[PDB]
Amino acid sequence: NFTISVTTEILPVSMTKTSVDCTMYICGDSTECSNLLLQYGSFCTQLKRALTGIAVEQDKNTQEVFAQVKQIYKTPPIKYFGGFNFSQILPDPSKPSKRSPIEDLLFNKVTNGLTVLPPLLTDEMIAQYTSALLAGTITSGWTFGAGPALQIPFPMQMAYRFNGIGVTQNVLYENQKLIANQFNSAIGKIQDSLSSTPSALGKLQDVVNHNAQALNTLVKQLSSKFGAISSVLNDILSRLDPPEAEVQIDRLITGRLQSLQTYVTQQLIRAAEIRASANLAATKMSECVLGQSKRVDFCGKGYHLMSFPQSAPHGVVFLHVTYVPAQEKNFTTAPAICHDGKAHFPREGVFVSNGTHWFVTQRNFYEPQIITTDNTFVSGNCDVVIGIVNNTVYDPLQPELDS
Amino acid sequence: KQLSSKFGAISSVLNDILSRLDPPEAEVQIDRLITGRLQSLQTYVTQQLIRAAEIRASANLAATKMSECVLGQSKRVDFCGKGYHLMSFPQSAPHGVVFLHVTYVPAQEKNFTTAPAICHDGKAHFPREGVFVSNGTHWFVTQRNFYEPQIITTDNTFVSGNCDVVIGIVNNTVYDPLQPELDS
Amino acid sequence: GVNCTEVNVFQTRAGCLIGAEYVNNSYECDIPIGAGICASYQSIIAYTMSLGAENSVAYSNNSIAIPT
Ligand SMILES: *[C@@H]1O[C@H](CO)[C@@H](O[C@@H]2O[C@H](CO)[C@@H](O)[C@H](O)[C@H]2NC(C)=O)[C@H](O)[C@H]1NC(C)=O
Ligand SMILES: *[C@@H]1O[C@H](CO)[C@@H](O[C@@H]2O[C@H](CO)[C@@H](O)[C@H](O)[C@H]2NC(C)=O)[C@H](O)[C@H]1NC(C)=O
Ligand SMILES: *[C@@H]1O[C@H](CO)[C@@H](O[C@@H]2O[C@H](CO)[C@@H](O)[C@H](O)[C@H]2NC(C)=O)[C@H](O)[C@H]1NC(C)=O
Numbered sequence A: 001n002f003t004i005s006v007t008t009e010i011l012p013v014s015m016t017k018t019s020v021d022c023t024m025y026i027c028g029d030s031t032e033c034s035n036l037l038l039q040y041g042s043f044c045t046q047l048k049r050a051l052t053g054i055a056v057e058q059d060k061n062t063q064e065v066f067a068q069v070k071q072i073y074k075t076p077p078i079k080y081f082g083g084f085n086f087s088q089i090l091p092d093p094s095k096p097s098k099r100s101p102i103e104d105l106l107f108n109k110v111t112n113g114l115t116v117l118p119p120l121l122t123d124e125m126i127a128q129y130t131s132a133l134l135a136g137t138i139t140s141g142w143t144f145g146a147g148p149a150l151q152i153p154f155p156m157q158m159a160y161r162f163n164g165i166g167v168t169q170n171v172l173y174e175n176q177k178l179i180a181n182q183f184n185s186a187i188g189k190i191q192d193s194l195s196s197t198p199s200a201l202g203k204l205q206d207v208v209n210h211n212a213q214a215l216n217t218l219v220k221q222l223s224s225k226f227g228a229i230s231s232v233l234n235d236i237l238s239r240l241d242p243p244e245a246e247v248q249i250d251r252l253i254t255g256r257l258q259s260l261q262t263y264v265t266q267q268l269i270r271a272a273e274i275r276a277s278a279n280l281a282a283t284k285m286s287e288c289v290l291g292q293s294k295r296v297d298f299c300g301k302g303y304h305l306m307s308f309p310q311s312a313p314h315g316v317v318f319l320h321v322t323y324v325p326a327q328e329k330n331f332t333t334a335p336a337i338c339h340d341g342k343a344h345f346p347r348e349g350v351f352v353s354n355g356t357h358w359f360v361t362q363r364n365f366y367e368p369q370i371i372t373t374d375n376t377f378v379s380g381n382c383d384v385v386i387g388i389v390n391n392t393v394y395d396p397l398q399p400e401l402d403s
Numbered sequence B: 001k002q003l004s005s006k007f008g009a010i011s012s013v014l015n016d017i018l019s020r021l022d023p024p025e026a027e028v029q030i031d032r033l034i035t036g037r038l039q040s041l042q043t044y045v046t047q048q049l050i051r052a053a054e055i056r057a058s059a060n061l062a063a064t065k066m067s068e069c070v071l072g073q074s075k076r077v078d079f080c081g082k083g084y085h086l087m088s089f090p091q092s093a094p095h096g097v098v099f100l101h102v103t104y105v106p107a108q109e110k111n112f113t114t115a116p117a118i119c120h121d122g123k124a125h126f127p128r129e130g131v132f133v134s135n136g137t138h139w140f141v142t143q144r145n146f147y148e149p150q151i152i153t154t155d156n157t158f159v160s161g162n163c164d165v166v167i168g169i170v171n172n173t174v175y176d177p178l179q180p181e182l183d184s
Numbered sequence C: 001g002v003n004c005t006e007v008n009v010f011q012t013r014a015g016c017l018i019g020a021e022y023v024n025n026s027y028e029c030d031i032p033i034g035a036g037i038c039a040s041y042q043s044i045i046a047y048t049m050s051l052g053a054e055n056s057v058a059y060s061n062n063s064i065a066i067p068t
């Protein structure tokens, strides 16, 4: 017996783009600031160029993770996909933001001179891209990330997914109601569990809190004396005498520029880490969604069947579909079957004997079939295989060549 | 270009300050100049390490694609090229590499009417590797990515179960070659 | 990010846009601005982003498509 479960794996994509007013943050409304700062060469153009490059890289990451298709597919008006309840996943038009209930739950759970830029792709367009991707991986199979989309009925696509993991498709067609009920129960369970557990949104909350704290500590550093006389421009450039005021304001702007350089270096390193995570999420979107990936523990714990992405604030969330077998059963095997002085070997599976009778079965499911010469290929003779057992093999057409 | 910055000093030439002012003030001027130039050099080195880390990540990705799309065939969907994968070649470029992925794009489709199983003689038939495709009157089994139809035979189908458990089954005959073989 | 009530003019959800008229039609993005506004030289116009053609595909219970 097999149990189908859905698991969550959350990956951030992009943080908030930032732009800094350089000479306004250093010191504003002072000609002495200008004639002391423009003689520092270029310690400001470098910072502005690096931060704008970071913003462009965040835009590129947002474009790369979600815009893997050049079409906006629309779901068919039929809501009967074969008994599967695609209502917590496929978006509905009654909501004002055109978002799925899981996206709504995830968005509701997640909660001078420094300027925060807005992203190019707003959340409505990200939700539209995810709706198009769900339409593509429901009604078109996996043959739409490679060429044009093709109509595939959903039970046959799911049978293809079972055929991808070494299990014959017929076990789907004798268990369709059970698979549909298990999938719907798993979807409802994960919908409840995304709200029941409070610490299931670590990465997105940590990245937005890190951005907020790194932006707050700069403004906190704006009001420190840095070993100078004071921390106010109108106090240091009016009460003092310019022979010492020039040195004091040079020390103060040197400290402020050092703090700004530290902030830019921290933002560069965090953006590099976010870029690596976004590349990993793009690989996940290209493999675990647009097709089946046979490698273990990259698209969910267990054998992988499909996955559905959902839009998230400052990132993406994945809902994998995994095939987890259970209900083990002990048996006695043999590497080969001996018959008439020649050995037989299984074509697709393994020779399994419960008691005094032998059967051939597929590898990941118990389906006993009578040993025929259409389930075996002969090779060599019966004196060298270690552990071979004696048993007759059914020939095909026995009662037919003499009738 | 940072050499021509005064850094709050009198000038940006070390020979000029040392040959025009007394050493008590020249010490302060050269100290400010040397700490400014040292800060500039540290900033350049930090930028170089960041860019080198990014280039290291990109070069590891390039070696990944070279080992997994030139030395062999990759079954990962949309990892090398837009479409199904065949093979690829590397070409050398200054300070980089350029691949030429060779892909397989199955355009010009034509849709049909299908069914997951065929019922005959009280038992259900399932396709071994293809899909049951009907063009309206007869039935055929064809490949999953190229429409080359073949007549249904017992040698490319496997039987399991009966006609009642599976849904969506249809009724059609199946060709068994032993019936035209036995009478001859 | 400046509400230009003190300094043709079309107001985006990114600040003020001066010198670019607004067109209700939509085209492919060339120069990104933010909040789903992209401007291109057709004069200079600013339009809502086009995500692509609405290539809807049919679906049934027994319809399959095979390339030839
Ligand atoms: C395989 O396991 C599933 C559940 O893990 C079984 O489905 C349950 O079956 C019992 C009785 O057999 C019912 O009372 C439950 O309502 C079923 N649950 C669901 C969700 O449908 C299934 O019967 C098992 N199949 C085999 C062959 O053991
Ligand atoms: C999917 O499962 C739900 C579980 O009950 C079905 O019922 C919906 O339940 C939610 C929350 O309990 C309500 O907000 C909806 O209004 C319910 N739907 C209806 C039609 O009343 C839901 O019907 C199932 N969907 C399908 C397509 O079977
Ligand atoms: C091992 O399993 C096989 C098949 O499940 C059993 O073979 C059948 O068992 C039933 C139950 O008595 C008999 O009515 C059939 O005649 C058996 N088939 C054949 C071809 O002999 C087999 O009995 C099981 N082994 C044990 C020790 O129980």
Ligand SMILES: *[C@@H]1O[C@H](CO)[C@@H](O[C@@H]2O[C@H](CO)[C@@H](O)[C@H](O)[C@H]2NC(C)=O)[C@H](O)[C@H]1NC(C)=O
Pocket (backbone or CB within 6 Å): B135, B136, B137, B138
């Ligand atoms: C469906 O395909 C079959 C096989 O290609 C077609 O059957 C053949 O049709 C041609 C054209 O009239 C005849 O010359 C052949 O003798 C037919 N072969 C047979 C009957 O085995 C069939 O016509 C196609 N159906 C439609 C509606 O196009």
Ligand SMILES: *[C@@H]1O[C@H](CO)[C@@H](O)[C@H](O)[C@H]1NC(C)=O
Pocket (backbone or CB within 6 Å): A328, A329, A330
């Ligand atoms: C199978 O046998 C092993 C020992 O050989 C035992 O530990 C295990 O519990 C058995 N499993 C079942 C399902 O009986």
Ligand SMILES: *[C@@H]1O[C@H](CO)[C@@H](O)[C@H](O)[C@H]1NC(C)=O
Pocket (backbone or CB within 6 Å): A338, A388, A389, A390
């Ligand atoms: C039964 O198996 C044993 C061990 O493989 C072998 O020695 C013996 O000849 C076999 N009996 C036959 C083939 O009748």
Ligand SMILES: *[C@@H]1O[C@H](CO)[C@@H](O)[C@H](O)[C@H]1NC(C)=O
Pocket (backbone or CB within 6 Å): B111, B112, C058
């Ligand atoms: C699918 O087939 C039907 C008739 O069988 C036809 O009306 C429809 O246009 C076809 N779909 C496509 C995309 O060609």
Ligand SMILES: *[C@@H]1O[C@H](CO)[C@@H](O)[C@H](O)[C@H]1NC(C)=O
Pocket (backbone or CB within 6 Å): B119, B169, B170, B171
């Ligand atoms: C197939 O034949 C059986 C037995 O005559 C019948 O019950 C069933 O309705 C038939 N199905 C179709 C699709 O004709």
Ligand SMILES: *[C@@H]1O[C@H](CO)[C@@H](O)[C@H](O)[C@H]1NC(C)=O
Pocket (backbone or CB within 6 Å): C003, C004, C005, C011, C012
């Ligand atoms: C700009 O300010 C006016 C008056 O306060 C307000 O009505 C308008 O909505 C503001 N613009 C935006 C884009 O909110």
Ligand SMILES: *[C@@H]1O[C@H](CO)[C@@H](O)[C@H](O)[C@H]1NC(C)=O
Pocket (backbone or CB within 6 Å): A080, C059, C060, C061
């Ligand atoms: C598919 O099956 C459902 C279930 O009854 C039915 O409502 C729908 O009309 C069917 N679709 C077609 C195209 O016949």
